[PDB]
């Protein structure tokens, strides 16, 4: 999740500290997952062949 | 633009003192929030 998050410490108590989304740093990209397609299709063919039986 | 999934929000709260209070801004996914009924609130 390529984002440098800033923790805004909000006093709403006394004591109680609320955290607000600090100004997200610059360029904007959403979370992801790089899945090795080689490892993905590997276990795919293994189980699928256990099913025509 | 190039829309945006999230929102640059702002709203009202309290602070260390009782009388005096506090507005502060945060950023929420449009999944975390929803509209209500002038701009969209």
């Amino acid at each position: 999740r390529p984002n440098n998050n800033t923790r805004k410490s909000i006093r709403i108590g006394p004591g109680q500290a609320f955290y607000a989304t600090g100004d997200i740093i610059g360029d904007i990209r959403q979370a992801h997952c790089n899945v090795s397609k080689a490892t993905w299709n590997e276990t795919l063919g293994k189980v699928v062949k256990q099913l025509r039986k | 633009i190039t829309d945006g999934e999230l929102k640059n929000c702002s709203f009202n709260m309290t602070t260390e003192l009782r009388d005096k209070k506090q507005k502060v801004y945060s950023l929420f996914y449009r999944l975390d929030v929803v509209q209500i009924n002038s701009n969209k609130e």
Partner: antibody
Framework: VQLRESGPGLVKPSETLSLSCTVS?????????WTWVRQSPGKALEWIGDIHYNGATTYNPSLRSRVRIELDQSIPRFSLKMTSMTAADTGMYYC???????????????????????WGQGTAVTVSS | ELTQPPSVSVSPGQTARITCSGAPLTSRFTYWYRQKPGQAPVLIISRSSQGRFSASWSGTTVTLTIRGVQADDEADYYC???????????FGGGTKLTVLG
């Protein structure tokens, strides 16, 4: 980035026309979109189409069913094709480089447009006999 | 049809503004070019990330602001971005900048 268009510049009415643009002298080119922009004599520069090396070409609406953009990426010399020609398409034709700048990974598209920062010398194109 | 002025005027020293109006300017960033009559349209406005030349976005319009009009800058200026469907591009008119004096 030399944009050496090797072309004729003259063609007959109702037949077809082909252009080229030898892309030479470079070290980060196919990042960006290769386009063709035309200007009728003293008129508006008007977009024709562009090509992203992978084959994802795009075309100007009222032209899309006649204009084609090829890719001899081995040379590399990319080409352009127009058909059913009249004198109305006469003017200056500028090959240009629609730039793309990325911070991350292509699959999620972490890039914007920089603009057409490399316009070629151009070829004066004429339709007559 | 992108709504530009085909020409604007300014005197030796003042600043100027060219407004390219339309519909898709509430969605796509705006890029600009400088074609001195017969030259290669020079790129000047970009989105390098999400000095004397700039352009201010404003709703249906994006206003090209030019500061420091030396007579060296007399040219046709063209606004160009993209429609809302991210398929095709096209250009506006071609603003001849006049330099008085």
């Amino acid at each position: 980035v030399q944009l050496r268009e090797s072309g004729p510049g003259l063609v007959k009415p109702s037949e077809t026309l082909s252009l080229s643009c030898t892309v030479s002298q470079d070290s980060r080119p196919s990042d960006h979109s290769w386009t063709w922009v035309r200007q009728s004599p003293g008129k508006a520069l008007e977009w024709i189409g562009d090509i992203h090396y992978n084959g994802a070409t795009t075309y100007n609406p009222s032209l899309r069913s006649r204009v084609r953009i090829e890719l001899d990426q081995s040379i590399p010399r990319f080409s352009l094709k127009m058909t059913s020609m009249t004198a109305a398409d006469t003017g200056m034709y500028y090959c240009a480089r629609n730039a793309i700048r990325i911070y991350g990974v292509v699959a999620l598209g972490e890039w914007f447009h920089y603009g057409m920062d490399v316009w070629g010398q151009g070829t004066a194109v004429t339709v007559s006999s | 049809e992108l709504t530009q002025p085909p020409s604007v005027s300014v005197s030796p020293g003042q600043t100027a503004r060219i407004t390219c109006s339309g519909a898709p300017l509430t969605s796509r960033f705006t890029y600009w070019y400088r074609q001195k009559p017969g030259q290669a349209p020079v790129l000047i406005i970009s989105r390098s990330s999400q000095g004397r030349f700039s352009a201010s976005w404003s709703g249906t319009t994006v206003t090209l602001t030019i500061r420091g009009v030396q007579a060296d800058d007399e040219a046709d200026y063209y606004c160009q971005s993209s429609d809302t469907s991210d398929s095709y591009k096209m250009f506006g008119g071609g603003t001849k900048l006049t330099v008085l004096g």
